[PDB]
């Protein structure tokens, strides 16, 4: 009965992108990026089941299955799969499942994560996505009149997001680690202020690339790269490297 939802993120010519969601299962973290991209056609994100509905707490593999089934409606020639944070691991496994089914995306776009992966979580995660029991109301009062998210980001949506986030933050590093080589190009966009013990893990995307793998430096840090002013430079670099010239 439960299914993930394919959500349109932009109003275009050029390749498509389907984004997989980070911990918490929402696509709303990609809206600002999607609005700044100019070299892409259709941009979608997959929204986890249960954020609308019966809540759902899927295993990592079940989440991949939900996302694959939803992306398969648009994926194939001319369409990237992409993701940030845990969304990058889901996107890698989603791409592998689409290949196994005879659907070949144009490539995989990883946003600033290596393969090896309370009120602070609210503020760190959804609080950054909204450029900000009491903390929750400041978020809902910020979202109340913000037209980019006001359609759906109710009190109930936020609660469901935070519970699913906590669940997905408990996934094992060993389970989300890529294993097999992916037969489409991988483009890795990485920020440049990680601690060195993290910075040295990005190159390992090449372990999982049967073909081309490209690294591109981007501004910001892990949490600010998807918000202004850094997101517009991220978008310009996606356009340059992956989008329509």
Distinctive features:
36% helix; 1 chain of a larger assembly; 14% strand; alpha/beta; 245 residues; Vlm2
Beta-strand portion reads 5-15%
Give the overall shape, derived from the CA principal axes.
globular
Rg over CA atoms, rounded to whole Å, is 17 Å
Element pattern in H and E:
EEHEHEHEHHHHHEHEH
State the secondary-structure class: alpha/beta
Number of helices: 10
Kindly, what is the distance between the CA atoms of the first and last residues, rounded to a whole number of angstroms?
42 Å
Q: Could you give the count of β-strands?
A: 7
Protein name: Vlm2
Organism: Streptomyces tsusimaensis
Family: Belongs to the ATP-dependent AMP-binding enzyme family.
Describe the SSE topology:
Layout: E1 5-8, E2 16-20, H1 31-36, E3 43-47, H2 60-71, E4 79-84, H3 86-100, E5 107-111, H4 119-124, H5 126-129, H6 134-144, H7 155-168, H8 173-176, E6 186-190, H9 196-199, E7 213-217, H10 230-242
Parallel strand pairs: 2-3, 2-4, 4-5, 5-6, 6-7
Antiparallel strand pairs: 1-3
Helix pairs in contact: 2-3
Family: Belongs to the ATP-dependent AMP-binding enzyme family.
Protein name: Vlm2
Please, could you describe this protein's structure?
The protein has 245 residues and is an alpha/beta fold. It has one domain (1-245). Helices cover 36% and strands 14% of the residues. The chain is built from ten helices and seven strands. It has a seven-stranded mixed β-sheet, with helices on both faces. Helix 9 links the parallel strand 6 (186-190) and strand 7 (213-217). The longest helix is centred in the middle third of the chain and has 15 residues, at 86-100. It is globular, with a radius of gyration of 17 Å. It is classed as hydrolase. Keywords: thioesterase, thioesterase domain, nrps, non-ribosomal peptide synthetase, nonribosomal peptide synthetase, valinomycin, hydrolase, depsipeptide, unnatural amino acid, 2, 3-diaminopropionic acid. The entry is titled "Vlm2 thioesterase domain with genetically encoded 2,3-diaminopropionic acid bound with a tetradepsipeptide". The protein: Vlm2. The organism is Streptomyces tsusimaensis.
